[PDB]
Amino acid sequence: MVRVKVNDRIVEVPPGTSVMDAVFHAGYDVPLFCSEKHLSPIGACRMCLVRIGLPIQWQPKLAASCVTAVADGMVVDTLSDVVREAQAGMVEFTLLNHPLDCPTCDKGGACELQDRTVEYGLYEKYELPVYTRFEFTRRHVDKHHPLSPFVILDRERCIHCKRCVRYFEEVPGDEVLDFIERGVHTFIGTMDFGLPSGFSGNITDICPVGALLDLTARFRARNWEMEETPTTCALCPV
Amino acid sequence: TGPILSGLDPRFERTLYAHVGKEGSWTLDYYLRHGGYETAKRVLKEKTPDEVIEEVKRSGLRGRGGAGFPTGLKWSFMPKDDGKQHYLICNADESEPGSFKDRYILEDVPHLLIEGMILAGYAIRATVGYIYVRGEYRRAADRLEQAIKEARARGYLGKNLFGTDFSFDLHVHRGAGAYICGEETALMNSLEGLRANPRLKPPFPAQSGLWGKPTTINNVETLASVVPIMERGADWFAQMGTEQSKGMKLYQISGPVKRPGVYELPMGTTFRELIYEWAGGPLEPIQAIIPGGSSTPPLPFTEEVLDTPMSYEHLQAKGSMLGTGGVILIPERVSMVDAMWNLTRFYAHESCGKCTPCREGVAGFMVNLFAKIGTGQGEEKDVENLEALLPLIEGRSFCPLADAAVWPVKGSLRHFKDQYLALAREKRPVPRPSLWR
Amino acid sequence: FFDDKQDFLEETFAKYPPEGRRAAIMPLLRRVQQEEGWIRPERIEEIARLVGTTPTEVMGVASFYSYYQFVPTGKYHLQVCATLSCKLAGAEELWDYLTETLGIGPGEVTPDGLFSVQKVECLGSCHTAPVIQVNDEPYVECVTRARLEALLAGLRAGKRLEEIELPGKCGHHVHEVE
Amino acid sequence: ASSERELYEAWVELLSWMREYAQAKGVRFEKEADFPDFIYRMERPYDLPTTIMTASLSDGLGEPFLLADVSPRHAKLKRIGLRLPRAHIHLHAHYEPGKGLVTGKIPLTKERFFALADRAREALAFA
Numbered sequence: 020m021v022r023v024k025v026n027d028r029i030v031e032v033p034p035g036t037s038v039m040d041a042v043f044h045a046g047y048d049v050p051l052f053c054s055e056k057h058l059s060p061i062g063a064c065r066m067c068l069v070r071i072g073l074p075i076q077w078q079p080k081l082a083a084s085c086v087t088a089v090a091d092g093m094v095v096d097t098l099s100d101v102v103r104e105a106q107a108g109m110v111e112f113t114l115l116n117h118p119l120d121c122p123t124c125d126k127g128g129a130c131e132l133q134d135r136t137v138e139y140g141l142y143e144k145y146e147l148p149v150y151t152r153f154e155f156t157r158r159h160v161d162k163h164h165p166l167s168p169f170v171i172l173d174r175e176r177c178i179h180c181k182r183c184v185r186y187f188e189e190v191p192g193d194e195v196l197d198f199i200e201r202g203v204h205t206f207i208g209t210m211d212f213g214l215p216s217g218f219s220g221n222i223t224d225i226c227p228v229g230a231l232l233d234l235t236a237r238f239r240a241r242n243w244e245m246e247e248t249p250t251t252c253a254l255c256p257v
Numbered sequence: 258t259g260p261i262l263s264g265l266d267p268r269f270e271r272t273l274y275a276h277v278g279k280e281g282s283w284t285l286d287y288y289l290r291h292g293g294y295e296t297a298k299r300v301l302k303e304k305t306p307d308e309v310i311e312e313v314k315r316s317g318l319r320g321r322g323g324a325g326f327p328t329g330l331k332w333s334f335m336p337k338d339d340g341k342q343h344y345l346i347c348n349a350d351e352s353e354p355g356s357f358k359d360r361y362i363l364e365d366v367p368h369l370l371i372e373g374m375i376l377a378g379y380a381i382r383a384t385v386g387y388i389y390v391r392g393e394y395r396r397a398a399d400r401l402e403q404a405i406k407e408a409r410a411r412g413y414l415g416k417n418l419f420g421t422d423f424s425f426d427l428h429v430h431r432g433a434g435a436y437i438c439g440e441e442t443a444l445m446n447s448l449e450g451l452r453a454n455p456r457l458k459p460p461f462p463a464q465s466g467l468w469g470k471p472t473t474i475n476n477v478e479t480l481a482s483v484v485p486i487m488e489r490g491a492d493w494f495a496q497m498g499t500e501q502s503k504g505m506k507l508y509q510i511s512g513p514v515k516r517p518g519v520y521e522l523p524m525g526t527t528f529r530e531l532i533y534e535w536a537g538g539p540l541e542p543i544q545a546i547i548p549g550g551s552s553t554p555p556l557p558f559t560e561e562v563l564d565t566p567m568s569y570e571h572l573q574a575k576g577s578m579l580g581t582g583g584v585i586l587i588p589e590r591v592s593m594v595d596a597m598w599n600l601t602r603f604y605a606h607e608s609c610g611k612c613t614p615c616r617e618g619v620a621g622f623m624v625n626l627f628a629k630i631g632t633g634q635g636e637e638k639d640v641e642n643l644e645a646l647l648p649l650i651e652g653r654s655f656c657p658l659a660d661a662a663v664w665p666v667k668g669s670l671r672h673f674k675d676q677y678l679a680l681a682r683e684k685r686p687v688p689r690p691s692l693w694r
Numbered sequence: 695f696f697d698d699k700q701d702f703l704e705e706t707f708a709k710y711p712p713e714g715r716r717a718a719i720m721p722l723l724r725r726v727q728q729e730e731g732w733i734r735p736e737r738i739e740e741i742a743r744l745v746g747t748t749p750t751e752v753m754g755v756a757s758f759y760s761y762y763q764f765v766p767t768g769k770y771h772l773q774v775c776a777t778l779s780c781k782l783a784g785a786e787e788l789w790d791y792l793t794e795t796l797g798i799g800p801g802e803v804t805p806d807g808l809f810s811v812q813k814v815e816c817l818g819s820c821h822t823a824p825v826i827q828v829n830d831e832p833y834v835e836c837v838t839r840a841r842l843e844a845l846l847a848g849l850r851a852g853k854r855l856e857e858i859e860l861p862g863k864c865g866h867h868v869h870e871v872e
Numbered sequence: 873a874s875s876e877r878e879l880y881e882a883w884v885e886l887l888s889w890m891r892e893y894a895q896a897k898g899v900r901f902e903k904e905a906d907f908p909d910f911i912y913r914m915e916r917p918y919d920l921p922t923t924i925m926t927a928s929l930s931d932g933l934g935e936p937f938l939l940a941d942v943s944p945r946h947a948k949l950k951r952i953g954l955r956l957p958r959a960h961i962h963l964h965a966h967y968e969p970g971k972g973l974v975t976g977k978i979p980l981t982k983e984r985f986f987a988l989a990d991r992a993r994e995a996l997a998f999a
């Protein structure tokens with residue numbers, strides 16, 4: 020195994036490990052939008068940035084911890100003003116064109132974007148705090164549109180991770196969802212209208228916000244209000 | 258004279274743009290009559306692949322795509338002998354504003370490019386080669402496909418070249434209008450029939466590029482230059498330019514200057530030389546100049562600038578950098594705020610959309626600041642945010658495009674910050690002078 | 695659409711590997727365009743089946759580029775270079791005149807059905823600004839206010855562009871101004 | 873200026889043409905979103921003419937071929953926008969005094985709007 024030292028804590032960890040896993044493995048944390056258990060990692064949201072030292076010889080630019088491998092005797096700082104200032108900034112770039120639906124949005128208290136904003140954003144520079152810098156016309160597009168009788172799509176809320184389109188290609192293998200235009204103009208869309216595959220409900224639990232939601236259960240209760248009963252699905256042998 | 262080549266010297270030789278503009282320059286006949294695939298034949302029977310790489314390592318050829326990287330050391334990364342198929346890609350997607358040097362090698366001396374790629378593939382054991390040109394370059398596209406055909410006819414392409422057990426074929430692939438497709442790794446995706454986002458590089462193109470395969474990508478200018486180099490020695494090549502910028506370079510210049518265009522000069526020659534001797538000097542008062550591409554930071558119109566040797570170093574340690582050798586002069590009659598109001602709404606357009614900081618960052622916030630302030634709705638707070646924004650972006654996006662955008666804005670605040678303050682504090686719109694005839 | 699011309703298909707699949715078929719998406723898309731003027735969603739379904747992927751995957755790929763039009767376009771789709779270098783030559787002015795004369799925005803087409811407009815990025819002939827690329831053929835460089843109006847009436851009277859006469863002179867890789 | 877009020881006045885009418893063309897050519901008109909500066913305006917005053925900030929003309933599948941929006945009362949550089957989703961074409965209508973609704977220099981009349989919506993409908997609408 021390889022020796023890594025996160026902040027003030029050192030850990031054993033196999034060679035191939037993502038610095039992101041090594042970070043969490045020491046019991047630390049970092050904003051994390053586009054990466055998902057069991058999917059191909061790519062630094063796309065640019066949230067999981069750390070500072071990396073490797074001889075102490077701080078590398079000049081910040082690394083995407085989720086697609087950076089770990090080297091023997093490496094240091095990882097996740098608390099520096101340099102880190103935290105960058106994070107709060109990246110949280111701001113995200114919320115920039117987002118819609119303002121939280122009360123009405125069914126993605127309630129179970130929304131990664133919400134949790135990560137209140138965790139790592141609005142940075143303390145060292146009276147009256149400034150909540151929003153962007154004062155222009157936010158992005159306006161197609162809203163509350165069902166893709167299938169089981170899945171309803173809010174494009175305005177999408178944060179362009181790749182969680183969904185990635186998954187369709189990788190796990191079941193049914194490329195029925197992709198982005199469209201480009202720039203600030205790009206969006207999720209389909210041409211295979213039904214939402215073909217029989218594994219299309221999974222994108223529902225991954226989507227980090229309330230773009231892709233379970234229509235079978237639209238507008239029933241807020242996520243905390245639900246009592247949750249863990250069990251097994253007996254509809255077949257698996 | 259006595260030592261080194263850095264100007265309107267009398268011992269300098271035009272090699273690339275030699276026959277550009279010459280009537281009928283692109284017939285396989287023209288190319289042959291002026292000693293066509295003479296070099297390529299030589300090299301293939303005589304120098305081995307490894308030997309044709311050292312002659313480029315020694316030439317000191319650095320990449321003309323704007324990258325600047327050591328293109329002899331670049332070929333040095335390719336898998337020696339594994340048995341896999343290897344790929345060579347000419348990057349004739351030339352889309353970075355103010356830059357147009359590739360275009361005319363494509364339209365008027367394509368066989369030079371072809372020969373240059375035969376050499377290139379030979380060095381790296383790539384039997385197959387591709388040319389991704391911009392789907393806007395119409396004549397260029399037609400002259401390449403033309404030439405690729407004449408070459409294939411007369412045995413200069415394909416089967417078994419010159420009797421030697423090497424075979425090499427070219428394929429053209431036109432684009433569809435996307436600057437980002439210029440990025441070496443986004444180009445591969447684009448070509449491969451995917452949406453052209455740049456790839457994750459920790460796995461490198463030399464070890465997995467086009468279709469999983471060991472590929473090497475180079476600029477048109479880089480490749481066209483592999484010929485004279487192999488024709489008349491690295492020593493000939495090195496005998497031009499600075500101590501880190503060897504050889505000659507395709508410099509082009511645009512803006513309100515007397516006679517804009519492409520001028521083949523050696524590495525080192527000064528801006529003052531290009532702007533004046535050749536281009537015929539300005540027609541308006543100038544306030545700044547953009548050295549390499551549009552992606553390079555603007556420098557003030559000063560003597561100490563005019564006398565700087567346009568190089569991968571004198572420019573480097575001068576704030577900016579030498580991109581594509583595409584200079585653009587900007588007249589005082591136009592506001593530097595506007596200049597970039599423009600350039601950044603150019604980048605805003607061209608962003609692939611993969612990164613939060615570029616998609617949302619520059620394409621969202623940045624272009625919108627310029628807007629406000631450039632209409633005279635601007636406040637002093639507006640110039641401060643814009644400034645504080647750049648470092649939240651530049652450091653860390655998925656690819657260079659993001660930097661390409663901030664750099665010119667950084668370097669514009671750092672020399673004209675008063676010009677931004679000016680518009681803001683007096684709620685004044687950028688000046689709208691008559692510019693076209 | 696491609697049933698008609700399968701000589702074009704053998705040929706263009708042949709430039710790419712067996713396992714490299716999507717590669718064809720670009721050249722196919724490209725054809726439809728230079729033939730029909732724009733790409734209809736039926737073309738995208740076809741091409742998907744031809745190249746061997748989903749309609750979804752091709753849809754995204756085609757909506758990524760600037761050249762592919764997805765709504766009808768007049769006979770002569772005028773693409774105007776807007777980028778800086780052409781700006782300093784008069785681009786914005788030329789756009790204001792052109793658009794104001796014809797009375798069309800980007801998404802529309804003139805009533806007489808032969809004039810679409812689009813702003814584009816650096817065409818890579820900055821030394822001859824302002825620059826204009828018609829459909830998919832050689833730029834019309836150095837569009838002075840006068841050079842322009844002639845281009846306009848040339849096409850307006852059905853002269854094939856490759857042989858309209860343009861006042862004044864325009865150089866190659868170097869250009870002399872007066 | 874007071875233009876802001878006349879621009880919003882013009883937002884109502886563009887919406888009016890949308891609802892007309894919609895019933896007329898029998899194609900779904902869909903209210904896409906309300907102004908959060910109404911929903912979340914509390915005891916605070918509200919004098920705007922409508923509460924609808926994003927409208928659209930969708931087809932049978934519900935995928936829109938025309939999208940329309942104006943910027944909220946509290947945002948800067950107010951413009952009204954028209955976008956053909958999927959065809960990459962964006963418009964930006966301002967408001968000039970005496971002239972009226974303009975896309976820069978060309979007036980945005982009912983007629984011209986209908987032209988765009990038609991072009992869009994025929995070209996874009998999936999079903």
Ligand SMILES: Cc1cc2nc3c(=O)[nH]c(=O)nc-3n(C[C@H](O)[C@H](O)[C@H](O)COP(=O)(O)O)c2cc1C
Binds near residue numbers: 352
């Ligand atoms: C965002 C971005 C856009 C680029 N666009 C182009 C381009 O349009 N043309 C080009 O030749 N290189 C472009 N490049 C640089 C390419 O990576 C370069 O062409 C490639 O390195 C060719 O290799 P060479 O420099 O060794 O010749 C771009 C790079 C980046 C980061």
Ligand code: SF4
Binds near residue numbers: 126
């Ligand atoms: S996706 Fe999250 S941030 Fe956006 S409206 Fe819903 S709960 Fe709020």
Ligand code: SF4
Binds near residue numbers: 178179181182226227
């Ligand atoms: S719809 Fe959700 S999962 Fe898909 S890219 Fe958008 S934010 Fe990510």
Ligand code: SF4
Binds near residue numbers: 612654657658
């Ligand atoms: S920096 Fe911009 S162009 Fe490059 S990968 Fe990110 S969003 Fe795409």
Ligand code: FES
Binds near residue numbers: 051066
């Ligand atoms: S989590 Fe690493 S970049 Fe998104």
Ligand code: FES
Binds near residue numbers: 354777819825
């Ligand atoms: S700026 Fe118009 S061609 Fe380069």
Ligand SMILES: [Ca+2]
Binds near residue numbers: 161164930
């Ligand atoms: Ca809908």
Ligand SMILES: [Mn+2]
Binds near residue numbers: 162163164165
């Ligand atoms: Mn709905």
Ligand SMILES: [Mn+2]
Binds near residue numbers: 813
């Ligand atoms: Mn464009």
Ligand SMILES: [Mn+2]
Binds near residue numbers: 916945946
């Ligand atoms: Mn209010």
